[PDB]
Structure formats: structure tokens, C-alpha cells
Subunit: 334 residues, 3 copies
């Protein structure tokens, strides 16, 4: 029935985002994406703790999909026979059938093709949701990502002015529940199925062992720090499919923030810390003013420093002594 | 002193809401309500776990009271001699005397009549609050509900347009703290008083055993699913008197959301997930576009699927293939 | 370089706030503050539990600093040799160098002078952040306060009208993690260093033993209740540097609330309960209408009544029977 142009997208792994237009002169298209599910044992911390992950496209989070209002998003979801469990996909951006979940349940060896019309603007979670107790389990095992539905005119500040980002990053935050043995050491398991009973018991107590960005402690640091230059406006999309978070850019601000993540609402301005409700994505833009290292955290600092939820930015440019200066370096008290 | 017309309301059990006008041509009235406290042992899950509940009018939540701005709400609170504890009522909608609590403490065998002027619009929690450590205990035992204070012109979108709902439901969410024995089984108690010491010990650790809507796992499912038709605008009032929640309609959206719950503020539009602060009520309206089953959850999915916090809607009407379609059903991967 | 007038401020202990102008005709100044760090063992509850606190200026929270937009805030941070640990300061109001943290690390015996330009309006957290796991530890040991950056025209309601407070209070909320021995009694330690291992173990489990205002259970009660008169507009700044909170004035409202705390955004109106994201300050103003006692709580009532997070207001003036009246005092049920 649907006679619109088709456009394929090559997804890229987080924190990066596939190339896209903000404002566009294109009309509605059918935008084609493929997600291939991978169950895999991964390392989640610098001590070598392992984790039975379940992923879209091999990553935690799943990749960010970007379209415009009124596009149709046509996703081929693939569950190779090398996996063990059924899986599906629920898009919080979509209308009907439990977000798509009720139309996309696939066993290992199967694939399905779902299309949904992007009638709601903003950033949105997508996640697996097979049914019943498997819903939380698949999500906290890593099976969640996000989609961004941009207005065709790009972003605005609510107050007729355009808001154009120079780059966008996607920070997916994951609460993880790794049980401990009697000794006190994290357990390892041979399969997701084998991990389930201990992992569910822990899940129901509502305290994660790890809270990470991009799948691992320290993922968005070192060589893989986020980057910017003084003068660049950076959009940071943050999602959390199961649990609240409170993002904060240490040494910066949220110049324009959509903490509930939906572009039909004006952004708030000049925030210190914002709030991502579990089950949502939000977005914050900041124009960097100072060079150096920044930390991007959830501002439960226990979670940030001790459980894994810290990213860095390395920013190049000229220091601004008007905005901040060390008037007197550390010295003995007179 | 107060020479206004009197109108009696027949309260109805949640999730339903007593009949009322949205926009009205009536002026201020004294609106009369009666709440009769019932302490009772109830079943809270499908395994037969019991719970020492304390209720207004026999239900968890207490019933939704609906009035208009500038009405006077005159409540007869009754504590029959068949109860064991003193009780009172605090309305977050009311001004003075700890919300009414300091004027309504009644022993078993007593009743009291409180009137308050509805000067604040929105949805608001009401709850018992006897004093000291009894405050949390009575609330988490079930002694909380909500009141809705509508503008006389009905609801609006902030942007001069009216927002009329076709039906309203009240979802009261309850965090419950049921201790376990050494075996690991939930305990049962012969009285609220007997439950108190174990229950307080658990409460202070801040992790509920159950998180339920309408008093029980599965209460708002099966025969008792919420209902709608495609085309109907449904208002969903959600309250949580003690603990945060993050509502989400799976397969839908919040078209217009007052997450802080107060009609003097414009609603936000197009939300995926919203946030009910513990100690508050909020409200979301959605116009259904697709038939079928929806789940209405808190989007801590552990809480939703594993601890009790899932409701269903069953929606009738015609499927819209433009909004969503299964392009290719599950098939073997080529 | 910077040729502006200098003004010294004499800080005062919370909940009070040093004298300041709301609207001002002054232009930018260099506003001088001194903070002297004190590590000390303190009592945190009415049972005599002790706690290894780390403070700015001897108090939990640290004192509220008040300036205007475009001022330069020049802080002399002093770490006397009588302390044991290095410390620094991070201002969420400031731009660059991890909020100042990367320019203010001082060993015992040292001081440093940092200046930052107040380019963002609102209330903001400041806290110590030495590095790594020490960050959460120093914060939850008490090393956090707030700064308020007022517009030069004072506050407004977003809707061209001025919002002038008659008084302001600063409520700093502190999550504390005091371990227990095998007996079940809270432990005491001889130094912060000695407390660290047990305290970190507890911290990572994310459940505080105490949640207090102004450093201690009951601090803002009795002789030290907050006060007001009927007719007075009171601004209540609330901060939480590590963990969410949900403030509520029992028997009142938030007439004008900036829950995210930033004056570039209009306030919300008529709230029952608001939300302070961990890592932030927010503010609420209320004009008292009724005399008597009010409780100001976080509306996790377990935290409020059982873990320490309750303040009182004692309000003088004439009772308003129009707003609320006890129509019939407690009596036997007919
Ligand atoms: O930023 C969204 C916010 O801005 C307003 C104007 O105050 O509308 C702008 O954004 C709409 C969505 O992109 C545009 O359709 C509109 O033309 C533009 O003025 C608000 O209505 C909206 O909530
Ligand atoms: O929806 C409330 C929001 O809308 C505004 C207009 O932007 O005011 C509308 O709602 C008021 C409350 O019902 C009415 O009194 C007013 O006449 C109407 O325009 C905002 O002022 C308000 O925050
Ligand atoms: O309260 C802030 C809110 O109000 C608006 C007007 O709707 O702007 C007022 O506040 C600004 C900041 O103080 C002033 O510069 C402006 O002149 C005044 O109208 C909004 O723009 C702002 O979000
Ligand atoms: O701003 N530092 O957590
Ligand atoms: O949208 N599903 O949790
Ligand atoms: O309003 N009382 O918690
Ligand atoms: Cu899955
Ligand atoms: Cu979901
Ligand atoms: Cu009671
Ligand atoms: Cu209350
Ligand atoms: Cu310190
Ligand atoms: Cu910080």
C-alpha cells in the first residue's frame, strides 16, 4: 500500500550516531534498519567480572536509530539460530501492539519485519519484552537502545529559535545484577539460562551490582572518552530502560534540556543535573566554553564512582580566565 | 456561617470514579463525602500472600473524590469500634492543620467532620498520618487515596484549548512491606499490631516486597482490565503516597501529562514515561488509536513484572496499518 | 586583570542565610567568601549515634552562598593542618575545571583561592570531590552545600510579575551510611579513615541508615523549628548532593516551585510535592495562610518519620475558618 521512497541506514555502535540531517527538505520516507540480536558473555568491569548479556547488534546500549517526524521506520529484527532464547522489540516511539512487541516475537532462527509511523517527536527507548518475568530480565541483560525522531525543521528552543548541534552522542545507562557467591565474589555462568535463577532473585531486591555506560565500567574513557572543542554544541542523548538516572556534566551545564525527552515540549535552560525516568530517554545540549577533562555522570556519586557510571569528555581549546581562574595556587595557610 | 448549597457524593471503588462534571456552570458548593475506615487482612498476590491492610472505605487506594475549584469538601471520617487503632486524614489539597490531620484524629468508635476549601487545582494525595512512626506505617498499610480538584472550565492544554476526557480511571500504586521468615516464606500476622515490629524493620530498609495497583497483583487485569475504544480520550490519575513511580502505557503515550499533577501548570505533550513523586498524584490523558491489549506499568520493569505493578487495557476498534504493520511475519532467516 | 569592586560576605550557619538583596542596582562585583574545612565526629540522632563528618565551615550542609548573575565568586578554601585528608571544592554553578575541583585540591595545612563567574542563575550544589571513590565518600560524609545566583531584577513568576520572599531558609538533606555491628548497633569510629572501609561497603548497597536535615535528626525542630507568620512568603532552598528527595510542606503547598532549581525557567505553581534530583538544589516559595505547626518532609514517609528527614515550621497568626474548619469535633458514632 505504502508508496514512499526507501532509504537504508547503516547503524553505528554507541556512543556514536549514524549520519543524519537535523532540519531536512525531505518528505516522509520508509527508513530501513536491521537489528541482529546477539547473546554473549562479556566483561563489565576492570576486575574481569563477566556478565551474560543479551544485545541488539552486539552492543549495550543497542544503537541509536535516527529518523524524522512522519517517517516510517521499517526494522528487520533477526534472531540467529546461534541464540538460545526468543526475543522481540518494543519501540516507545510507536503506536499499537505493545510498541511492536506483540508483532515481533521470534525464535532462534527467525526474523520479522515491523514498520511503525514516527508520529511522536523526541528520543525514546526501544527494548525487548518477550512476556512476563522475561521482560525485566531481557532488558537488564542489555536488550535496550533508543530512537530519535527529529522535527523536520530541526530542534528549537521554544522561544522561535533554532538549536543546531555540532555532534551528538548516545549514552545508554545499564543497571546490571550480578550475583555473588558465599565468598563474596561475583559469579560467572555458562549461559543466560543458567544465570537466570540467581539473577532474578537479585533483581527483585532492586539494587544493581553495576551501573555502567556503554556496557562496561570505563567504556567512555581513555582512548574512548567523548570529545569536543570549545565552541561546539554537543547533544547528549541519555537512556535508561529500567531505572532512574540523574545526569550531570561536571564543569558544565545542560544549556537546553528535555529531561522527559520529547521535542513537542520546550527545553528547560541552564540545568545542573537532570532526571531520566526509568523507561525513557532524555537529551541535553551544551556548548562547551572551557577546555580540559569533564566527567559525565549520574549524580548518585556512589553509582558514578563506585558502580561504574562515569564517562569523560576531553575538550580542546583555550582556557577562559574570565569564567574561572585559580587566583592563588595551593599554599601554606598564613 | 457558610451558606452554600450542599451536594452529596456516592463514592465508588477504584479504579472507577464517581460521576462528575468537567466544565460546570455550578458555583461553589459544600460537597459531602463519607469515608469509613476498615482494617482488614487481605490477599495481595496470586500465591495467597496475606497482608494487614488499613483502608479508607475498604479499598486500596481509597476512592477518588472529585470536586471543583472553590468548592468546600466536607468529609465525615468514621473509625468504627471494630478497628484497633486511631486514624486521621491529611489532604494534600487542603490548607492548614497538617492537611486536616491535626483536626481529625479519631479513636475506634468515633467520627469527625472536617471541611476544607478547594483552593488548589489538580490531583492530590490524601492519607492517614496519626503521628510519628505511625505515619509511614498507616500509609504503607494502604491508608491513602486521592482527590481531584477540577477547574470550573474543565481542563485545558495551556495552548486556550479544551481537553475533555471520555472516561477517567484512578490507579493507586501501593508499596507493601511483607516480612519473610527464615524459610524465605512471607509471614502472616493476626492483627496489624502484631505485624508492626517486623513490618517496621523491613520498611526502614526501603525495599518493598510488592508494588501493586488497586491493592493486589493482577487487580486491573482479566475481567477487571481497564477498557477503552479507539477514539476515546482516557484520563489516568496515578498516585503514590510514599514512593516514586514511573508510569508508562505500553503501546501508547501520554498525549497530555501533568506529572506533578497540578492544573495551574500546562500539561507536557507526547511523553513515553512520566514520573509520580512519592507523596503525590499525577495525571495523563491519551486518545487511543489502536485496538488490542495494552499494559500500563511502572517502568521499573522488575517492579512491573515481578513485584505486581502491571494493569491492562483492553481496547476495541479497528487496527490502523498506517500507524503500525507487520510487514513480514516471523520466518526462517534466508 | 579584573578591576571590579570587592565585597566580603560573613557566612552564617544553615538553615539561615546571610543577608542579601533580591533585586539590586549594583553591578557585578567580586564577592569574597571563606570556607574552612572541618573533619569532626558528631552526633546524628537522638539515641546518640555518632558519625565521622567532613564539613565546610563546620556545618552540614555547608552554608548557603548568595550572589547575583554576573558577579564573580572568589572563595578562599582552607584545609587546616588539624584535618587528615585532602579536600577540594566543585561548584555546580561554575564553568570549567570540574566545577573548580581540578583547581582546589589542598592538603591539610594548605589553602587555595578560586574565582568563578556566576553566569547561570538558580540554586546549585557545591561539594568536595577529591577524585575516584573519595568523591562519594566525602560528599556523603557531609561535604556539600549550595549557592544561590539571583537575577539582578530578583525573582519572577514567568507570567512579568515579581516574586519577593520575606525570608529564605536553606534545608540541606544528607543521606548517611552508618554501619552496624553483628549485635545490630551502629558502629563508632576513631577517625574518618577508620570508618572508610565499612562505610564504603554500606554505601555501595545504596540504602542510607539516616536521612537528615541540617546534620541531625530533629535539627530543625523545638527551639530550632523554622518560623513564619501568616502572610509571609518564605523561600525554601532544598539541596541533596547525592540522592533524590521529594519535599513536601504538610498543610501547605509550593506556590511557586523551581524543582530543577534554575531561574531561567518559570516556576511551576500550586504543587503538593516536588522533586530534588540527587546532585542538585531546588527552591519553593509559599505564602503562609494558616497558623500552627507544619512539618516539612521528604515524602518518602519512612525516611521522614523513621530515618530523620522531618523539619517543623511554627507559624503565628489568625486561623482561617474559611480555608479549613473542624465542623464537628470527634464524637461517638451515632
Ligand atoms: O520547543 C517546543 C515548544 O515551542 C513552541 C513555541 O513556544 O512551538 C515551537 O515548536 C513547535 C514544535 O517544533 C513548532 O511546531 C512551533 O511552530 C514552534 O513555535 C511550543 O508550542 C512548543 O511546546
Ligand atoms: O494549562 C494551564 C496553563 O495555561 C495557561 C495559558 O498558557 O492558562 C490557561 O489556564 C488557566 C488555568 O486554567 C486559565 O486561567 C487561563 O485563562 C488559561 O489561558 C497558563 O497561564 C497556565 O499555566
Ligand atoms: O521566570 C523565567 C521565565 O519567564 C520568562 C517570561 O515568560 O522570562 C522572564 O524572566 C527572564 C529571566 O529572569 C527575564 O529575562 C525576562 O525578561 C522575563 O520576561 C521566560 O522567558 C523565562 O523562561
Ligand atoms: O559535580 N560533581 O559531581
Ligand atoms: O514498553 N514496555 O515496557
Ligand atoms: O502530608 N503528609 O505527609
Ligand atoms: Cu530479548
Ligand atoms: Cu517499555
Ligand atoms: Cu490510619
Ligand atoms: Cu502527605
Ligand atoms: Cu573533602
Ligand atoms: Cu557534583
Amino acid at each position: 500500500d505504502l508508496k514512499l521512497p526507501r532509504q537504508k541506514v547503516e547503524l553505528v555502535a554507541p556512543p556514536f550516531v549514524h549520519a543524519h540531517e537535523q532540519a531536512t527538505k525531505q518528505g516522509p520516507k520508509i527508513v530501513e534498519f536491521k537489528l541482529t540480536i546477539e547473546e554473549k558473555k562479556v566483561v563489565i568491569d576492570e576486575k574481569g567480572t563477566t556478565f551474560q548479556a543479551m544485545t541488539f547488534n552486539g552492543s549495550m546500549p543497542g544503537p541509536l536509530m535516527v529518523v524524522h517526524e512522519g517517517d516510517y521506520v521499517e526494522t528487520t529484527l533477526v534472531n540467529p539460530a546461534t541464540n538460545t532464547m526468543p526475543h522481540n522489540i518494543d519501540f516507545h516511539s510507536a503506536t499499537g501492539a505493545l510498541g511492536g512487541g506483540a508483532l515481533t516475537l521470534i525464535n532462534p532462527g527467525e526474523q520479522v519485519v515491523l514498520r511503525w509511523k514516527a508520529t511522536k517527536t523526541g528520543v525514546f527507548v526501544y527494548h525487548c519484552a518477550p512476556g512476563g518475568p522475561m521482560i525485566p530480565w531481557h532488558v537488564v541483560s542489555g536488550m535496550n537502545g533508543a530512537v530519535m525522531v527529529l522535527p523536520r525543521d530541526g530542534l528549537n528552543d521554544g522561544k522561535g529559535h533554532a538549536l543546531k548541534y555540532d555532534k551528538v552522542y548516545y549514552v545508554g545507562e545499564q543497571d546490571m545484577y550480578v550475583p555473588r557467591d558465599e565468598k563474596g565474589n561475583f559469579k560467572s555462568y555458562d549461559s543466560p539460562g543458567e544465570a537466570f535463577t540467581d539473577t532474578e532473585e537479585m533483581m527483585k531486591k532492586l539494587i544493581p551490582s553495576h551501573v555502567v555506560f556503554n556496557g562496561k565500567v570505563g567504556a567512555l574513557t581513555g582512548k574512548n572518552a567523548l570529545t569536543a572543542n570549545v565552541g561546539e554544541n554537543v547533544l547528549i542523548v541519555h537512556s535508561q530502560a529500567n531505572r532512574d538516572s540523574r545526569p550531570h556534566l561536571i564543569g558544565g551545564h545542560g544549556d537546553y534540556v528535555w529531561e522527559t525527552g520529547k521535542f513537542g515540549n520546550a527545553p528547560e535552560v541552564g540545568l545542573e543535573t537532570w532526571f531520566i525516568r526509568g523507561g525513557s530517554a532524555g537529551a541535553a545540549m551544551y556548548k562547551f566554553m572551557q577546555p580540559g577533562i569533564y566527567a559525565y555522570v549520574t549524580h548518585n556519586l556512589i553509582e558514578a564512582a563506585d558502580l561504574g557510571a562515569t564517562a569523560h569528555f576531553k575538550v580542546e581549546g583555550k582556557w577562559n580566565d574570565d569564567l574561572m581562574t585559580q587566583v592563588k595556587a595551593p599554599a601554606e595557610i598564613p
